[PDB]
């Protein structure tokens, strides 16, 4: 249940304070949330929206925006960008 993130995602996690390069999925989600907070990508007035266009996160998602009410695009990105070790 350890995952290794592809390099661009790893860079994002480190930017949010993560250390090392092996993580649990729980850790990955924690640090991604923290990244969104530190980079000010959330909408303060519409707190379901993340505006990730023009950030590396948007590049990974292939999106300008996503809603936390629909985790599908984020989870699809994570499936593609995480390597699960035995």
Ligand X SMILES: COc1ncc(-c2nc3c(n2C(C)C)[C@H](c2ccc(Cl)cc2)N([C@@H](C)c2cccc(Cl)c2)C3=O)c(OC)n1
Q: Which residues contact 46 (CB under 8 A, 6 or more apart)?
A: none
* Angle at alpha carbon of residue 78, lines to 75 and 80, rounded to 5°: 115
Candidate list 19, 20, 26, 44; residue touching ligand X; CB under 6 A: 44
Whose tokens are 């266009």? That residue is 53
CB closer to ligand X, 79 vs 86: 79
Q: Which region, judged by CB under 6 A, interacts with ligand X, from 3-11, 17-25, 31-39?
A: 31-39
Q: Facing residues of 67 across strands?
A: 49
28 near ligand X, rule: CB under 6 A:
no
Binding residues for ligand X (CB under 6 A): 29, 32-33, 36-37, 42, 44, 47-50, 68, 71, 74
């Amino acid at each position: 249940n350890q995952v290794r993130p592809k390099l661009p995602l790893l860079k994002i996690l480190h930017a949010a304070g993560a250390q090392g390069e092996m993580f649990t999925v729980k850790e990955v989600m924690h640090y991604l949330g923290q990244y969104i907070m530190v980079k000010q990508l959330y909408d303060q007035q519409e707190q379901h929206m993340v505006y990730c266009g023009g950030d590396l996160l948007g590049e990974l998602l292939g999106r300008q925006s996503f809603s936390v009410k629909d985790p599908s695009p984020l989870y699809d990105m994570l499936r593609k960008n995480l390597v699960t070790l035995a």
